[PDB]
Design a protein around this motif. Structure first.
Motif, mmCIF file in Angstrom:
data_model
loop_
_atom_site.group_PDB
_atom_site.id
_atom_site.type_symbol
_atom_site.label_atom_id
_atom_site.label_comp_id
_atom_site.label_asym_id
_atom_site.label_seq_id
_atom_site.Cartn_x
_atom_site.Cartn_y
_atom_site.Cartn_z
ATOM 1 N N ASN A 8 -5.645 -8.313 12.043
ATOM 2 C CA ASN A 8 -5.409 -7.168 11.169
ATOM 3 C C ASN A 8 -4.083 -6.487 11.481
ATOM 4 O OD1 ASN A 8 -6.099 -4.921 13.264
ATOM 5 N ND2 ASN A 8 -7.871 -6.298 13.309
ATOM 6 N N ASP A 9 -3.689 -6.452 12.756
ATOM 7 C CA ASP A 9 -2.388 -5.895 13.111
ATOM 8 C C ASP A 9 -1.259 -6.717 12.506
ATOM 9 O OD1 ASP A 9 -3.158 -3.637 14.405
ATOM 10 O OD2 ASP A 9 -2.780 -4.372 16.439
ATOM 11 N N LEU A 14 3.434 -5.892 8.107
ATOM 12 C CA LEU A 14 4.158 -7.079 7.679
ATOM 13 C C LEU A 14 3.928 -7.321 6.196
ATOM 14 C CD1 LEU A 14 5.989 -9.169 9.110
ATOM 15 C CD2 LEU A 14 4.744 -7.684 10.695
ATOM 16 N N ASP A 15 5.005 -7.634 5.482
ATOM 17 C CA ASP A 15 4.881 -8.015 4.087
ATOM 18 C C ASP A 15 4.215 -9.387 3.984
ATOM 19 O OD1 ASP A 15 7.131 -9.551 5.023
ATOM 20 O OD2 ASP A 15 8.414 -7.889 4.387
ATOM 21 N N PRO A 16 3.455 -9.624 2.920
ATOM 22 C CA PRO A 16 2.640 -10.851 2.826
ATOM 23 C C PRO A 16 3.449 -12.136 2.938
ATOM 24 C CG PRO A 16 1.951 -9.248 1.190
ATOM 25 C CD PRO A 16 3.219 -8.718 1.779
ATOM 26 N N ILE A 23 0.315 -15.608 10.269
ATOM 27 C CA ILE A 23 -1.092 -15.982 10.284
ATOM 28 C C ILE A 23 -1.238 -17.488 10.402
ATOM 29 C CG2 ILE A 23 -3.227 -15.959 8.944
ATOM 30 C CD1 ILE A 23 -2.789 -13.300 9.996
ATOM 31 N N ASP A 24 -0.342 -18.255 9.780
ATOM 32 C CA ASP A 24 -0.402 -19.707 9.896
ATOM 33 C C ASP A 24 -0.149 -20.177 11.322
ATOM 34 O OD1 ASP A 24 0.264 -22.623 9.563
ATOM 35 O OD2 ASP A 24 0.006 -22.098 7.447
ATOM 36 N N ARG A 25 0.829 -19.585 12.011
ATOM 37 C CA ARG A 25 1.049 -19.931 13.412
ATOM 38 C C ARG A 25 -0.176 -19.601 14.257
ATOM 39 N NH1 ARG A 25 5.545 -18.485 16.203
ATOM 40 N NH2 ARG A 25 6.694 -18.018 14.280
ATOM 41 N N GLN B 27 10.748 -9.661 -0.486
ATOM 42 C CA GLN B 27 11.887 -8.747 -0.570
ATOM 43 C C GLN B 27 11.499 -7.467 -1.318
ATOM 44 O OE1 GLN B 27 15.126 -11.659 -1.847
ATOM 45 N NE2 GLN B 27 16.217 -10.488 -0.273
ATOM 46 N N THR B 28 10.596 -6.724 -0.681
ATOM 47 C CA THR B 28 10.066 -5.502 -1.272
ATOM 48 C C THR B 28 11.185 -4.521 -1.600
ATOM 49 O OG1 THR B 28 8.704 -3.550 -0.814
ATOM 50 C CG2 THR B 28 9.637 -4.725 1.080
#
Lengths: 48, 48
Positions: A8-9, A14-16, A23-25, B27-28
């Protein structure tokens, strides 16, 4: 190698688009750990 | 020029000389979060 060990942190702060790679790593690492655990358990089950 | 696609959508709009690099997945920014937004899972080419 991820920023934090808290999912969750990582999700927040972090932008998606890059949260996806973080998250993949983390997923790759945790999946490798689980695979190692089940392989060792298979070895121990054969011995038992 | 070697592949076919189910359909092609051409979107046209006008922005400043800047933020053309900002028009992209992620790129928000003001244009991203309040105007035409490009999904992080994109399969198209932006032309400026």
């Amino acid at each position: 190698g991820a920023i934090s060990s808290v999912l969750n942190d990582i999700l927040s702060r972090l932008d998606p688009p890059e949260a996806e790679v973080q998250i993949d790593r983390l997923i790759t690492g945790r999946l490798q750990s689980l695979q190692t655990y089940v392989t060792q358990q298979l070895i121990r089950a054969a011995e038992i | 020029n070697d592949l076919c696609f189910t359909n092609v959508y051409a979107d046209s709009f006008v922005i400043r000389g800047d933020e053309v690099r900002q028009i992209a997945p992620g790129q928000t920014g003001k244009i991203a979060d309040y105007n035409y937004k490009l999904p992080d899972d994109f399969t198209g080419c932006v032309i400026a």
